[PDB]
Design a protein around this ligand. Structure first.
Ligand SMILES: [Mg+2]
Ligand SMILES: [Mg+2]
Ligand SMILES: [Mg+2]
Ligand SMILES: [Mg+2]
Lengths: 245, 245
């Protein structure tokens, strides 16, 4: 009878990278009268916050906010400390990775390069051949070339082989980047903390729950009751059926 | 009888990287009753702003704010547009530079690497072997090793030779980095805009006015009356002598 509803954000609660619909937002607060609610997203906290309210409203509107897949956690309004990727991987593998990337990207010739080719986050390294400090038009330009030349895909193939057996995973970061993260630091990461919070049931809702999707692992994990949705409206209706029948 | 007093910030108006003394700040506002006043600094606007007031007070307290040596300019409260380094250098030299740096740093093995090894600014590229996303203790650790191994100094020697004749200049960026900027984009850069503003006299005040110092060029430029100071109190007294005799 302690229940948590845990939601992916993009395509589950909001249009991708955009603000939640007030009606959906209103339902979630009602749902809170029956269960605790939480969000888990790959984006950083500032982005998620911006999609789910004004200011830091989000940490008050939700019982849990898991940013960067739960490597950053807010619990009932309070920021918890997070394990760092350097602490987890150790400095030597981390620098091996970094130097391989620097070396690989040195040899890539693009139309434009900018800066912040490697962004050190909590949950991962974000790798971007063009550089994260590019403009929107520059992103589209890179994106178009990337499809033609498989720039990010070939980079990732080289990295996976190079680091075979060493516990690194890779995922697409939009148009211009990819993430490198430790094995297990997908959305499931947040389930480890949730494990200590005495929930009787954790319901997870996501829109990418098929193999390869960024919700697959947390959806399939035996610690969650999994729910597959196709839209914020679908998520609301599913919740109505389960919790307000 | 249109006069501008233009001040370096660090060691000229404030302790380096710290907040201005209220008494100095008070005098500068008085000085404004006789002349226009402006600041020019290598740091970015957010840093300079933070040293010179709360919020964006600075653009109201000074007639001109030249951040990153004037590549960013506020004039009487208004942000002016700025030429970009890519526009000035062109994409091919820019990427030649970037790829040389990526390649060089790939081969450097440090105690720790983080991220943002190349930060694209308006006025320059900031190059950091450890990565700009490191903590203060990590900066000191790098700093100590850098002195032992001449990491940044050797990097810069290699860059200068490689790009000989191509109009690039280099300067120390604290403990962990160096800047790469186009020839002429030292503090003198701000004098070009000032040239169109019909000042009868521009007085420049700086604490690094000897050859090699970051105020030397603007101090020595024939467009300024140069003043060499050793402290914020010295700057105030010099101004008193000249403008309130
Ligand atoms: Mg989604
Ligand atoms: Mg499950
Ligand atoms: Mg100074
Ligand atoms: Mg002069």
């Amino acid at each position: 009878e302690r229940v948590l509803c845990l939601f992916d954000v993009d395509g589950t609660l909001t249009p991708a990278r955009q603000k939640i619909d007030p009606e959906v937002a209103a339902f979630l607060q009602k749902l809170r009268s029956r269960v605790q609610i939480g969000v888990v997203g790959g984006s950083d906290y500032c982005k998620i916050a911006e999609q789910l309210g004004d200011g830091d409203e989000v940490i008050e509107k939700f019982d849990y906010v898991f940013a960067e897949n739960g490597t950053v956690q807010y619990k009932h309004g309070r920021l918890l400390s997070k394990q760092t990727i350097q602490n987890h991987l150790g400095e030597e593998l981390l620098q091996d990775l970094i130097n391989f990337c620097l070396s690989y990207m040195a040899l890539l010739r693009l139309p434009k390069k900018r800066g912040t080719f490697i962004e050190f986050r909590n949950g991962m390294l974000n790798i971007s051949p063009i550089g994260r400090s590019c403009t929107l038009e520059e992103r589209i330009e890179f994106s178009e070339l990337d499809k033609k030349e498989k720039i990010r895909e070939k980079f990732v193939e080289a990295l996976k082989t190079e680091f075979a057996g060493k516990g690194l995973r890779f995922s697409r970061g939009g148009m211009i980047s990819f993430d490198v993260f430790p094995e297990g630091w997908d959305k499931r990461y947040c389930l480890d903390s949730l494990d200590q919070d005495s929930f009787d049931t954790i319901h997870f809702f996501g829109n990418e729950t098929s193999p390869g999707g960024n919700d697959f692992e947390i959806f399939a994990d035996p610690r969650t009751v999994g729910h597959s949705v196709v839209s914020p409206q679908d998520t609301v209706q599913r919740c109505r059926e389960i919790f307000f029948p």
